[PDB]
A paper describes a structure:
Here, we identify an evolutionarily conserved hexapeptide sequence as the major aggregation-prone region (APR) of gastrointestinal peptides of the glucagon family: xFxxWL.
The amyloid crystal structures of APRGLP1, APRGLP2, and APRex-4 revealed the nature of emerging interactions between charge-abolished side chains contributing to steric zipper stabilization.
Numbering used by the authors: 1 to 6
């Protein structure tokens, strides 16, 4: 699982 916040 991951968080990708741009």
């Amino acid at each position: 699982d991951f968080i990708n916040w741009l």
